[PDB]
Ligand binder design. Structure first.
Ligand SMILES: CSc1cscc1CC(=O)N1CCC[C@H](C(N)=O)C1
Ligand SMILES: [Zn+2]
Length: 139
């Protein structure tokens, strides 16, 4: 679990969104596993606006932060689930690192701010849904 709180927005994995998130829906994209809902309170997370390929992510299955080198956001295959059929997920960045299903929502950050959130994983790899291209989160 986990979310990014920037201004009057809350960004979560689309497959983990609540009834409240869907009733206060701003934007969602199944191909990216992202959903953004409105909030009444203000958020203060800085979103990175960069092309960084190194950072640190939170891993709740280990209660630890891990430094990682990660790929550029791209289309990558992902297998089925009670959530999605086998398909390609866009805007996905991969790193060598530990992750389990409950790890989705953990934030990935570089020196510039929030890069994205844990969204996929398996076989010693972890995947992050990029948020750096969503320029409207700041306006
Ligand atoms: C960090 S997720 C994870 C680690 S080991 C097994 C997993 C599961 C995983 O990758 N899923 C299942 C939940 C929906 C995800 C998606 N974004 O399509 C795909
Ligand atoms: Zn950066």
């Amino acid at each position: 679990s986990g979310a990014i709180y920037v201004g009057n927005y809350r960004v979560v994995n689309r497959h983990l969104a609540t009834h409240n998130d869907w009733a206060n829906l701003v934007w969602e994209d199944s191909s990216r596993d992202l959903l953004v809902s409105s909030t009444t309170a203000q958020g203060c997370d800085t979103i990175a606006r960069c092309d960084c390929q190194t950072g640190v992510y939170y891993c709740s299955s280990r209660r630890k932060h891990y430094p990682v080198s990660f790929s550029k956001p791209s289309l990558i295959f992902v297998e089925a689930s009670e959530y999605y059929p086998a398909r390609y997920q866009s805007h996905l960045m991969l790193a060598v690192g530990h992750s389990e299903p409950g790890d989705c929502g953990g934030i990935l950050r570089c020196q510039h701010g929030v890069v994205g959130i844990v969204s996929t994983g398996g076989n010693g790899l972890v995947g992050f849904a990029d948020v750096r291209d969503l320029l409207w989160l700041d306006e």
